[PDB]
Design an enzyme around this catalytic site. Structure first.
Site, PDB file in Angstrom:
ATOM      1  N   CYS C  31       0.805  -1.213   0.000  1.00 32.76           N
ATOM      2  CA  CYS C  31       0.000   0.000   0.000  1.00 32.76           C
ATOM      3  C   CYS C  31       0.843   1.269   0.000  1.00 32.76           C
ATOM      4  CB  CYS C  31      -0.936   0.006   1.212  1.00 32.76           C
ATOM      5  SG  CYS C  31      -2.239  -1.243   1.150  1.00 32.76           S
ATOM      6  N   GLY C  67       9.383   7.058  19.477  1.00 31.23           N
ATOM      7  CA  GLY C  67       9.525   7.890  18.304  1.00 31.23           C
ATOM      8  C   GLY C  67       9.030   7.284  17.011  1.00 31.23           C
ATOM      9  N   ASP C  69       6.228   4.345  17.049  1.00 38.97           N
ATOM     10  CA  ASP C  69       4.890   3.783  17.168  1.00 38.97           C
ATOM     11  C   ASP C  69       4.475   3.753  18.631  1.00 38.97           C
ATOM     12  OD1 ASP C  69       7.125   1.812  16.676  1.00 38.97           O
ATOM     13  OD2 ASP C  69       5.711   0.483  17.704  1.00 38.97           O
ATOM     14  N   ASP C  87      -3.981   2.332  12.545  1.00 37.09           N
ATOM     15  CA  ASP C  87      -3.491   1.665  11.348  1.00 37.09           C
ATOM     16  C   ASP C  87      -4.644   1.483  10.373  1.00 37.09           C
ATOM     17  OD1 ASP C  87      -1.704   0.568   9.610  1.00 37.09           O
ATOM     18  OD2 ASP C  87      -1.228  -1.198  10.819  1.00 37.09           O
ATOM     19  N   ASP C 110      -0.186  -3.202  17.205  1.00 37.51           N
ATOM     20  CA  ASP C 110       0.757  -2.183  17.654  1.00 37.51           C
ATOM     21  C   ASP C 110       0.864  -2.167  19.173  1.00 37.51           C
ATOM     22  OD1 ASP C 110       1.120  -1.037  14.897  1.00 37.51           O
ATOM     23  OD2 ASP C 110      -0.995  -0.521  15.182  1.00 37.51           O
ATOM     24  N   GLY C 161     -17.778   3.148  18.456  1.00 40.85           N
ATOM     25  CA  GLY C 161     -17.795   4.381  17.702  1.00 40.85           C
ATOM     26  C   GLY C 161     -16.968   4.233  16.444  1.00 40.85           C
ATOM     27  N   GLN C 163     -16.163   6.238  12.364  1.00 35.50           N
ATOM     28  CA  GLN C 163     -16.586   7.160  11.322  1.00 35.50           C
ATOM     29  C   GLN C 163     -16.686   6.389  10.016  1.00 35.50           C
ATOM     30  OE1 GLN C 163     -18.351  10.041   9.978  1.00 35.50           O
ATOM     31  NE2 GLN C 163     -17.292  10.714  11.838  1.00 35.50           N
ATOM     32  N   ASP C 265       6.403  -4.621  15.505  1.00 36.34           N
ATOM     33  CA  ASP C 265       5.531  -5.379  14.622  1.00 36.34           C
ATOM     34  C   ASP C 265       6.016  -5.228  13.189  1.00 36.34           C
ATOM     35  OD1 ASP C 265       4.924  -2.769  14.192  1.00 36.34           O
ATOM     36  OD2 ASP C 265       2.757  -2.963  14.471  1.00 36.34           O
TER      37      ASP C 265
END
Ligand SMILES: [Zn+2]
Ligand SMILES: [Zn+2]
Ligand SMILES: [Zn+2]
Ligand SMILES: [Zn+2]
Ligand SMILES: [Zn+2]
Lengths: 154, 303, 379, 379
Positions: C31, C67, C69, C87, C110, C161, C163, C265
DNA sequence: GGAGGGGGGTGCTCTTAAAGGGGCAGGTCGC
DNA sequence: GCGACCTGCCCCTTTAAGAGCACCCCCCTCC
């Protein structure tokens, strides 16, 4: 690109080996018999002699201490891939070899050689090395004995 | 228990308000080390403070702590005040060990240089002033025992100092796993029981042809069956039960740097790298000031 | 649930030609084609100049705990900390249920890198493709959401919750948060020479995903059909989907037990990039070296056949919902793999020791000829 | 900077043909066309048949604070409550700096609906575009990051961490978190008849941004040329780009001081949709009616000139980073507008009283012909 | 264009010997 | 008389290293 399989024998006396292809016959003859050479290991005190050029590169591994193979489980360092392959058998718990008299299973042929002493079998063995009369069964085993022990050195 | 968290909280509150007074006058607005942007202030209540702020405050508290009359505190009592503060933090939900945790390494160095210069005080009358910090103060404050790797290491060091009479970092490093011989006592009190003890040959001499060597000379560890928690033998066994298998039987060192992260069911608590001289010196000055160690030093030293 | 049987489009009133992966421009580089540039951008958004605060006249953990994750961000009340992660991955498996589970596992992975085994709350970002027809949207999205919630349930947290937005490509992801005491998470900044790296999941998931999508394009298949049979691709795809849809809760829990120093990871940037990022964080001067590279069976052959597309041997192939690269001491690592294979709780999985830690200059490399380990498709 | 020269491609060496909004397909019909479907998807995300757990013999707040937005998740320590939000808005203005500011403001505005005046942490999802030149990426994205971080400064927090992805459209957003005590947030559940609703920002941002995007293409500007000119759109566009980049910290702080029952943010779903959603979690059986709407300058005529594509008067028109729909008592509300208009600190802003709360069926509706009060930019 | 030869370097299977840990079996000192 | 301790020697297993073949890679080739 694999050519069809044919078998050709080294007609030279003392080498009854049969090779998998005519291609390999030229390599065998050249690298074994015709190429008569002597080299000396660069190490100051080794004093060994190797006729091939391939062997020296392997020998350099013995004198150095570079271990580039790490076991998956115990993170132990080895100098060669096959040594690791033998080591992994400990973690997988597999014992391939097996004595043909008492059904005693082991991991390596070195263990089996020890077991054959109980089932005394050197009596039926005919081959043996000239120096210390080792009483082996097959032929190339005598070469291995002459390599590890009774070494050819300066 | 003679340990008062209220006194430590009150001293912290006094210092915090005093510093806040000077914080505004300097007019140097420096943000606090928390997520939301706020003017750096020392919260009067200890509990609601960040790790960085608490560390920095306790560092400054060493040099700016003031008695009730406004006089600077003595080195023998700053340690008691800090122990009370830590007891306050432990009993209010905080899990911070102001003495052992890595974040508070700065604090110990300043406390160390404050405590190193201390000497027992002799009054004009003549009698020596007894120290204000006692063994039960450490035991109740959870600075000794088997709660965390650092605490267990400190407990073993404390017992070695008390019994084996080790009184200096340079002299104290000689101890090693190999030379600390365990021998189950030959004579149990009754056949049913089986007494156990730990010994150490601290005698220094030529040791030639059986000279300077005798059974009654080398220092020995007793065993406490009244309260198993404080028993030196149990703690030593627990220590050897958690150190790596490879360490046992080596002559180089005895104290191992505790692992950074440990769980209740972690088989191994300690690494294989011995604690540096600096850390041993830091955590030995804090254990000489204690009263019982002082008495033990005097008794053996006196005779 | 789609775990009982493979997702069949007809069963849900969808045409045979339909495939969920059609809503993303899949590529061998993942990606993010310019992996290096995205690293620069992530550093740019993470980096903050005020956080130094004159070092506070001491040495304390940073707001950006490492610095790179899972920022820690200490709070005010109770001296607690707020570890939070995010992520986003586009669909890579046909099954919507398993895809949602994979997205949830990737979001949670993570936190498990930092040793946190509990999540208080989680949010979800669900994106519906423009091209998808209305009949498809109400048949696939419910499955995705059900899978996401099921994955959250297994993690001891709830999705409460989120979006929803329109997008040319389906965007599936979330955000995991946890408020924990200072002693509940391992800050991955410790590392000492002599330790050994440990991996919990095999590599080469992207290769298996890409190949499975090459079974419909005649032009691509003929190039690779020579080296691998269809059955091998099918089993590799199944294994990768099962692995990518698995939580690292057990690994995170065991991290505390066996005195872990650092962890991360393998989600994106491959194994080498993540190790390089991890190496810079270490306080000491330690450089990692990776000797073994566990790969899914037969995927390495495809990786080398396709050319400079994946380069698993170079440790640059991107991965999704990858494992944990845990730094443990030698004996602890020896024990770590044993317990994770047969946990007391059960349902164990294999782990490998892929390298060593040596004194260096905060860098990570891979030996010239890595020993590729072909993990079998167990059960 | 706020008043600095607008992003000029020539100044930053970018070609004149550059346009930030070109990277997304703006749809004046709506922010998300299937809103009635996507609202159902979001409700499915937020729904949990298990959170009730027999209701636990109490009227306590559910696992979701309102079940619509800004979930209030209780924590294990000290009775603290975790508050989170998330938003993702594609570019709608041509200045990268303000776009990051607007994204940060939109993400934060959900918290200020609940009265939380402080933010602890903030992530950031920055998705670069495939259809973007290498130089454009390096000369655009840093500006967005800097704008987002600067907006964080005004918010009283910091941007730590985030994620970056490749996406055919540029995606800007983040997650704002806050661990706040029970006496720091206002639960939107409460309400009482006799109240008056207050809006802290004007409507019509979507219309202004779309119309300014229509200026470049000449085949669309023609049908709106009669209603307004290009000068009018410039002032309206500048005002909208100024209001939607404004934080609601002052609104959040004054919410407590004036006894606010409940409030919500007008973002995306439109004023009508957001008011209806607000009416669905009121303990009382009350309804909202809006007798007045403060549409931006000249943005009421334009929507008529575009048929039913915008529908601003009906309340369906989407907005981004919109104000707060605060419900206050009649006596308190009159003072709230007075205080916000002339703050002691400065930066005055206007607020209006739009409607009344009357006993009904827990739903919101708008009168047949709402009056439109024209708001012109301040000087 | 080309399949066949020449030259080189290498992994894998087999073999043997060397190193090493565990355990059985003495001699010495203590109780 | 019985045991603990130190040490020596043998047993069996694991690691280390050589031998050679089958193989690949590259290069060259004159038909
Ligand atoms: Zn021959
Ligand atoms: Zn040699
Ligand atoms: Zn091993
Ligand atoms: Zn036999
Ligand atoms: Zn011989």
């Amino acid at each position: 690109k694999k050519p069809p399989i044919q078998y050709v024998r080294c007609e030279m006396e003392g080498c009854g080996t049969v090779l998998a292809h005519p291609r390999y016959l030229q390599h065998h003859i050249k690298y074994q018999h015709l190429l008569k050479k002597k080299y000396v290991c660069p190490h100051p005190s080794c004093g060994r002699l190797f006729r091939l050029q391939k062997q020296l590169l392997r020998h350099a591994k013995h004198h150095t201490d570079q271990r580039d193979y790490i076991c998956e489980y115990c993170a132990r360092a080895f100098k060669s891939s096959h040594n690791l392959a033998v080591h992994r058998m400990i973690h997988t718990g597999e014992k391939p070899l097996q004595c043909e008299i008492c059904g005693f299973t082991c991991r390596q042929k070195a263990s089996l050689n020890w077991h054959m002493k109980k089932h005394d079998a050197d009596s039926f063995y005919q081959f043996s090395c000239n120096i210390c009369g080792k009483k082996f069964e097959k032929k190339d085993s005598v070469v291995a004995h002459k390599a590890k022990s009774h070494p050819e050195v300066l | 228990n003679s340990l008062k968290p209220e006194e430590g909280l009150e001293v912290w509150k006094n210092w915090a308000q005093t510093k806040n007074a000077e914080l505004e006058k300097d007019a140097q607005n420096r943000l606090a080390p928390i997520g939301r942007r706020q003017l750096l202030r020392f919260q009067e209540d200890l509990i609601s403070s960040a790790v960085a702020e608490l560390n920095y405050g306790l560092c400054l508290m060493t040099r700016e702590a003031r008695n009730g009359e406004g006089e600077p505190y003595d080195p023998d009592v700053l340690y008691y005040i800090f122990l009370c503060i830590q007891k306050y933090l432990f009993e209010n939900g905080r899990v911070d060990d102001i003495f052992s945790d890595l974040y508070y390494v700065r604090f110990t160095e300043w406390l160390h240089e404050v405590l190193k210069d201390v000497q027992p005080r002799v009054t004009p009358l003549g009698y020596v002033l007894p120290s204000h910090v006692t063994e039960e103060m450490l035991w109740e404050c959870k600075q000794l025992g088997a709660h965390s790797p650092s605490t267990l290491l400190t407990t073993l060091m404390f017992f070695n100092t008390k019994y084996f009479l080790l009184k200096t970092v340079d002299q104290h490093m000689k101890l090693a796993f190999s030379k600390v011989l365990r021998q189950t006592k030959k004579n149990p009190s009754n056949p049913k029981d089986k007494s156990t003890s730990i010994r150490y040959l601290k005698a220094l001499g030529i040791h030639q042809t059986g000279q300077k060597v005798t059974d009654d000379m080398y220092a020995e560890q007793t065993e406490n069956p009244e309260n198993p928690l404080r028993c030196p033998i149990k703690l030593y066994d627990f220590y050897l039960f958690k150190c790596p298998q490879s360490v046992k039987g080596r002559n180089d060192t005895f104290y191992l740097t505790p692992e950074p992260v440990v769980a209740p069911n972690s088989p191994i608590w300690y690494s294989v790298q011995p604690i540096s001289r600096e850390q041993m010196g830091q955590m030995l000055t804090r254990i000489l000031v204690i009263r019982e160690i002082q008495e033990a030093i005097a008794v053996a030293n006196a005779s | 649930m789609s775990t009982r049987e493979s997702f069949n489009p007809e069963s849900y009133e969808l045409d045979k030609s339909f495939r969920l992966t059609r809503f993303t421009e899949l590529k061998g580089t993942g990606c993010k084609v310019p992996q290096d540039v995205l690293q620069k951008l992530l550093e740019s958004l993470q980096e903050n100049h005020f956080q130094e605060d004159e070092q506070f006249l001491g040495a304390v953990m940073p707001r950006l705990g490492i610095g790179m994750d899972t920022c820690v961000i200490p709070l005010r009340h109770g001296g607690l900390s707020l570890v939070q992660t995010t992520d986003y991955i586009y669909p890579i498996v046909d099954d919507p249920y398993m895809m949602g589970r994979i997205a949830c596992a990737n979001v949670l992975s993570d936190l498990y890198a930092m040793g946190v085994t509990e999540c208080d709350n989680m949010l979800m970002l669900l994106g519906v493709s423009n091209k998808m027809t209305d009949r498809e949207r109400d048949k696939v999205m419910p499955l995705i959401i059900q899978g996401f919630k099921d994955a959250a349930e297994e993690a001891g947290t709830s999705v409460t919750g989120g979006q929803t937005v329109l997008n040319p490509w389906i965007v599936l992801g979330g955000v995991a948060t946890t408020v924990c005491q200072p002693n509940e998470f391992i800050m991955p900044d410790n590392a000492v020479p002599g330790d050994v790296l440990v991996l919990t999941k095999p590599l080469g998931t992207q290769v298996a995903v890409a190949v499975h999508q090459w079974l419909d394009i005649p032009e691509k298949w003929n190039k690779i059909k020579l080296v691998v049979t269809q059955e091998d691709v099918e089993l590799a795809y199944q294994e990768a989907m099962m692995n990518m849809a698995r939580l690292n809760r057990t690994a995170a829990g065991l991290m505390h037990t066996f005195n872990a120093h650092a962890a991360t990871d393998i989600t994106g940037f491959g194994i080498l990039g993540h190790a390089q990022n991890l190496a810079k964080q270490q306080r000491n001067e330690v450089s990692f070296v990776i000797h073994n590279l566990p790969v899914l069976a037969k995927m390495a052959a495809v990786s080398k056949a396709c050319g400079n597309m994946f380069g698993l041997m170079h440790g640059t192939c991107p991965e999704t919902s990858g494992g944990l690269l845990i730094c443990l001491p030698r004996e602890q690592a020896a024990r770590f793999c044993a317990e994770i294979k047969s946990p007391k709780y059960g349902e164990g999985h294999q782990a490998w020791i892929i390298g060593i830690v040596e004194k260096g200059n905060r860098t990570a490399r891979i030996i010239d000829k890595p020993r590729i380990i072909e993990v079998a498709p167990q059960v």
